A and B are shown apart, each in its own frame.
Chain A
Amino acid sequence: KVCEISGKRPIVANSIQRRGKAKREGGVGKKTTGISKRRQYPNLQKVRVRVAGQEITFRVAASHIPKVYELVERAKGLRLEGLSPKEIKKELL
């Protein structure tokens, strides 16, 4: 699925099977022996976090984890609470 932080989402890429000596060595060169569709997924993970009172998890690509510990630091300077686990995350931008 998609990173709640970055917007990263699985992308489509090819899987190319080759054979042969690279031209840059012995030579002749390589020959593609099959291409096919496939996807690459973002490295999505789970981040449970305290914040205000309520617990709040993120779905986020590993690359962007820190970016959350940025928000929690930007979140301190705010008026919040009021039984709102999800309504926090929303307000957490």
Chain B
Amino acid sequence: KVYTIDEAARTAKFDETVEVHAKLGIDPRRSDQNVRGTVSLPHGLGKQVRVLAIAKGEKIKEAEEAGADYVGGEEIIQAAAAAAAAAAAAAAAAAAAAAAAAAAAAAAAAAAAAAAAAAAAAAAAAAAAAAAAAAAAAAAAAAAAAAAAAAAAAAAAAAAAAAAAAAAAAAAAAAAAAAAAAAAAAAAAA
């Protein structure tokens, strides 16, 4: 109407099952694309941001409590490497990549915000917020959204997640917005 009306969700009970969907170019040029691993978003959304990180035996204190729950160390590296029906994500600092034991038996991990010692640091807001989704053969898009109690707090994806549109080199025009799920669907410009 005169803007993209989130409070036009006025279909069951507790609503955090709304979404943002779209489409773009198919194998544009020759590679593909990649979303911002947990887009920081102008709202922390107060979500239980499950960070199943890849810390050391030293980051068991504050790698958890920077807007998350559980974090392990060397006890989930080599001990949880032999499990195919049981056993967000930070990254081991400097350069110690996770495909030496944690790619054994496509997931979801870019990195965590820098500090060189802590995670819940002397300035920590962008660390518990919105989601991300990479390629998808046909289309792509497909992200999460927001909570049931939010007037203006839901319209946070106009120049943020719908401006994740910064990894589509060339093909056509990388936008075909269509938001809302588990009830209905509205579609809007960004």
Are A and B close enough to touch in the complex, i.e. CB under 8 Å?
no
